[PDB]
Amino acid sequence: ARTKQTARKS
Amino acid sequence: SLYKVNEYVDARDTNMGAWFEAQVVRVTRKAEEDVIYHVKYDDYPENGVVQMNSRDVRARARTIIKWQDLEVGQVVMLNYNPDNPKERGFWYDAEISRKRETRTARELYANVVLGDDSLNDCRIIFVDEVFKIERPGEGSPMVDNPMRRKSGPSCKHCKDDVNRLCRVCACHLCGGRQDKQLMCDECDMAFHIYCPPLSSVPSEDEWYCPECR
Ligand SMILES: [Zn+2]
Ligand SMILES: [Zn+2]
Ligand SMILES: [Zn+2]
């Protein structure tokens, strides 16, 4: 479940 | 130790090899600079206090090396985005490999060092943002709150206007940068948690916003 916290690192 | 509590430093993420702006919160030892640095990341409160091996902490970068002072073979810290080499990315260590200046462009090439392997001959886009790597012992400690490096990537459409409307880099419905934001897996567009309801970030590895189903 992809959080914009998670992806905040490309 | 080398680095004191409250001192501003860069901490390297061992997965991706990138260095991040962080700050020393507590210092503990294990058994000599094989100590443990407890750092909190400047713009990543959600990760709280992380423990760093000493080989992965140095004094905060402060000094920019101008294009004209860049020598091949020099080892520096610069910005690169290995998934999108034309865009801004993160901060990696690199050995400068080649420079070419023509009437239209200043061309910087370097070997970017990532998590494990290196990435030879990268075309560095941000030639005016190359940092000298602070050397241990030499140079002063950074104790006063410093200016921030810019890290990517950049919304071409809102120009990262950290104060504006953006139905792209922010909620595809509103745009409010208002921890628990979630993102489509077909469109890659971000959504909130609210905008029907929700509860506590789904199990499922994939998850969706209506326009891609
Ligand atoms: Zn934007
Ligand atoms: Zn919204
Ligand atoms: Zn979608």
Q: Name the nearest CA neighbour of B124 among B104, B95, B102.
A: B95
Q: Name the nearest CA neighbour of B183 among B171, B199, B165.
A: B171
Task: Give the CA count within 13 Å in the CB-facing half-sphere of B72.
Answer: 8
> What residue type is assigned to position B6 of the chain?
N
Residue B138, CA distances (Å) to B59, B74, B133, B134 in order: 10, 18, 11, 8
* Span from the CA of B190 to the centroid of ligand 2 (angstroms): 9
Whether residue A4 and residue B181 make contact (CB cut-off 8 A), yes or no, is yes
Same-domain check for residues B84 and B15: no
Residue that is last in its domain, among B26, B42, B62: B62
Same-domain check for residues B114 and B127: yes
Task: Kindly list the residues of chain B whose beta carbon comes within 8 Å of any beta carbon in chain A.
Answer: 13, 16, 44, 46, 81, 83-84, 89-90, 152-153, 179-183, 185, 190, 201-207
Experimentally, the structure was elucidated by X-ray
Whether residue A1 and residue B90 make contact (CB cut-off 8 A), yes or no, is no
Same-domain check for residues B104 and B13: no
* Chain A residue closest in CA terms to B184: A2
Query: What whole-number distance in Å separates Cα of residue B21 and Cα of residue B173?
Result: 31
Phi, psi angle pair for B139, to nearest 5°: 70, 160
Residue B137, CA distances (Å) to B2, B121, B145, B183 in order: 8, 31, 20, 44
Query: What residue numbers bound the domain in which B43 lies?
Result: 1-62
The number of distinct structural domains making up chain B is 2
CA-derived radius of gyration, chain A: 5
